[PDB]
């Protein structure tokens, strides 16, 4: 595997471990992975980290009632660029009515970028992904990992 | 002020804001600032971050019962190098006997480096600094700022 490919695999393992930990504990989370559409305008709204990825840091960011937990984490390649970032709210009618602002923000950024956003529901622990204006809910651990590997 | 001086002051303000919040909430914390003696061997025991300093990230790191809260944060070159790092425990018989391992770790690293370590007590919220093998206890906010500026 090339170093780039190994680094990607490590980042995916770190994300999936953090998401699984948060889902089990009903820690709401909103994590956008920048792809080819640059997200600088949204990164600049948050608190800069420019930090190496780890499952530990991802989990620490989203702990309820802490400075960094409200808003989106935006990742650039193998780094956490910023936390507590603004994303635009979607008005799509295909967002389940019971869902709150994290899911609407995720679909919103997915309408104007090619990013992949993962959401953990604080109500149910369900994991969802927003991409290209669509929300895919109730993902298994295996499905999330496959989606990330394909991305 | 020059860019380097403005950056140093921003970091001092971020540190003091985090320490003040943790003192108020009696959140135990251990934060070592590397100086001329390299601390790479201790940095390598922790979770790599290489993150920009912010008061928000410092607070999020030390929240109890989280992945990153157990061990020292080590700062280097105006960044958070790593969290959850090992520091050596002092065997000094001249540390106040009611203090536990966080304070002994701070004194211990200060015995073998020129670093400055800040400790927040989880028992009292008291703020102390270890340097040169001595622990300076029960600091006011002004006293901590003076130490950081002198350092
Ligand atoms: N801001 C914040 C503080 C805490 C906490 C929890 C247990 C013990 C001490 C502090 N959790 O979130
Ligand atoms: Mg389904």
Swiss-Prot record, chains A, B:
Q: What induces it?
A: Constitutively expressed, part of the cdaA-cdaR-glmM-glmS operon.
* Molecular function terms from GO: adenylate cyclase activity; ATP binding; diadenylate cyclase activity
Per its Swiss-Prot or TrEMBL record, what regulates the activity? DAC activity is stimulated about 20-fold in E.coli by coexpression with CdaR.
Per the UniProt entry, the Enzyme Commission number(s) are: 2.7.7.85
Output a single Gene Ontology CC term carried by this record: plasma membrane
Which keywords does this Swiss-Prot/TrEMBL entry list? Answer: ATP-binding, Cell membrane, Membrane, Nucleotide-binding, Nucleotidyltransferase, Transferase, Transmembrane, Transmembrane helix
DAC domain boundaries? 2-141
Which domain of life does the protein's organism represent?
Bacteria
Q: Which GO terms describe its biological process?
A: cAMP biosynthetic process
- Primary localisation category: membrane
Q: Where in the cell is it found?
A: Cell membrane
- Could you say what a knockout of this gene produces? Increased sensitivity to the beta-lactam antibiotic cefuroxime (CEF), upon overexpression of the c-di-AMP phosphodiesterase GdpP greatly increased sensitivity to CEF. Double disA-cdaA mutants cannot be made, suggesting they are lethal, while double disA-cdaS and cdaA-cdaS mutants are viable. Depletion of cdaA in double disA-cdaA deletion cells leads to cell lysis. Exponentially growing cells are extremely sensitive to H(2)O(2), no change in response to methyl methanesulfonate.
Q: Does the keyword Zinc apply?
A: no
SUBUNIT field? Probably a homodimer. Interacts with CdaR. May interact with GlmM.
Function comment = One of 3 paralogous diadenylate cyclases (DAC) in this bacteria, catalyzing the condensation of 2 ATP molecules into cyclic di-AMP (c-di-AMP). Upon expression in E.coli leads to c-di-AMP synthesis. Probably the main producer of c-di-AMP for the cell; is probably implicated in control of peptidoglycan synthesis. In B.subtilis c-di-AMP is a second messenger that mediates growth, DNA repair and cell wall homeostasis; it is toxic when present in excess.
Q: Which family does it belong to?
A: Belongs to the adenylate cyclase family. DacA/CdaA subfamily.
Q: What is this protein called?
A: Cyclic di-AMP synthase CdaA
Q: Which organism is it from?
A: Bacillus subtilis (strain 168)
Q: Which residues of the full protein are shown?
A: 103 to 252 of 273
